[PDB]
Amino acid sequence: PKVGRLIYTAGGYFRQSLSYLEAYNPSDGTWLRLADLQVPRSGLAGCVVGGLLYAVGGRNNSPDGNTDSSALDCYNPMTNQWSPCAPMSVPRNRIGVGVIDGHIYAVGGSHGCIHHNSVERYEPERDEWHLVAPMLTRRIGVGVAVLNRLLYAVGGFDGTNRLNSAECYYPERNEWRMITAMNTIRSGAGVCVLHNCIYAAGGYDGQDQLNSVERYDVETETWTFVAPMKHRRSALGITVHQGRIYVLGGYDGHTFLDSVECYDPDTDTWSEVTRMTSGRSGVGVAVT
Numbered sequence: 001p002k003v004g005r006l007i008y009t010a011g012g013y014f015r016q017s018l019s020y021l022e023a024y025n026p027s028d029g030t031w032l033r034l035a036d037l038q039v040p041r042s043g044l045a046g047c048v049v050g051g052l053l054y055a056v057g058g059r060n061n062s063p064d065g066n067t068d069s070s071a072l073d074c075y076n077p078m079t080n081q082w083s084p085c086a087p088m089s090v091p092r093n094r095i096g097v098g099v100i101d102g103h104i105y106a107v108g109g110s111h112g113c114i115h116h117n118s119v120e121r122y123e124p125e126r127d128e129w130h131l132v133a134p135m136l137t138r139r140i141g142v143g144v145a146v147l148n149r150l151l152y153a154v155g156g157f158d159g160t161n162r163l164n165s166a167e168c169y170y171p172e173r174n175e176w177r178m179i180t181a182m183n184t185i186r187s188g189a190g191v192c193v194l195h196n197c198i199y200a201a202g203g204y205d206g207q208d209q210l211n212s213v214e215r216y217d218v219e220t221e222t223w224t225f226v227a228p229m230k231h232r233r234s235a236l237g238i239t240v241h242q243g244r245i246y247v248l249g250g251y252d253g254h255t256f257l258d259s260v261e262c263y264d265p266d267t268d269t270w271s272e273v274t275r276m277t278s279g280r281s282g283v284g285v286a287v288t
């Protein structure tokens with residue numbers, strides 16, 4: 001094929017919610033603009049299932065109004081087209097998603113002043129949503145990752161407190177269990193899994209955006225700091241591509257970042273590999 005896997009960035013915020021879909025090719029550093037979202041959105045989550053890109057929740061924060069989204073839309077790289085899917089039970093801004101067994105899990109997020117602890121599961125082959133057990137904590141700006149077929153919800157804001165706690169969901173049981181809490185309080189952090197560990201990068205602690213990064217190891221059941229990113233940021237996009245973590249854009253209290261940093265787990269170092277076509281925060285990112 002002309003290209004390998006690409007890192008897709010959908011939506012985001014800059015002065016207002018965006019409809020951009022762009023793709024970065026790690027092999028030659030080129031960016032490509034694709035079909036716009038049907039509705040602008042930011043604070044959404046992105047994931048892939050069966051070669052299809054999904055844009056979940058978020059909100060359309062515009063000059064003349066704000067509308068939280070319960071929408072799920074699907075993008076097909078093969079034809080460069082967006083398709084509306086069944087919507088979720090409720091709008092979820094600052095949502096988290098994870099994929100397990102080809103099913104998409106929508107986690108927490110908010111609707112107005114409602115901070116969800118609820119969680120629902122989407123089955124693409126049926127285009128239908130079903131709620132599952134709710135998290136033990138209400139979490140918006142929660143980070144979500146999957147490890148050993150278990151869904152992890154990390155940090156966030158419960159409506160009052162910003163959290164350093166994290167919990168794990170066992171689909172086979174439909175039970176949530178708290179795990180060791182992180183070193184740092186983080187809402188709107190970038191959370192992903194890489195080489196059998198969960199990473200939590202950046203975020204906001206209630207006083208400033210963060211550049212520190214920590215890693216959870218399941219057999220020691222502990223969170224350990226790794227090399228920090230060069231640029232502090234919350235509401236960043238994050239994904240994994242061939243053994244490395246990519247963080248995209250974000251917000252640091254002063255700027256909408258276009259910076260994209262890459263983490264090398266073998267040397268424990270971060271490098272700025274490229275820049276988005278324009279700075280922005282709250283993007284949905286995935287690789288396919």
Ligand SMILES: O=C(O)COc1cccc(CNC(=O)Nc2nnc(-c3ccco3)o2)c1
Nearest residue numbers: 012013014015016042043059061251281282
């Ligand atoms: O809805 C989202 O996903 C993000 O919402 C955010 C995030 C960070 C800051 C804000 C506040 N909005 C904001 O600062 N807008 C703004 N700032 N500067 C401009 C601007 C500059 C020139 C023209 O407009 O617009 C909203």
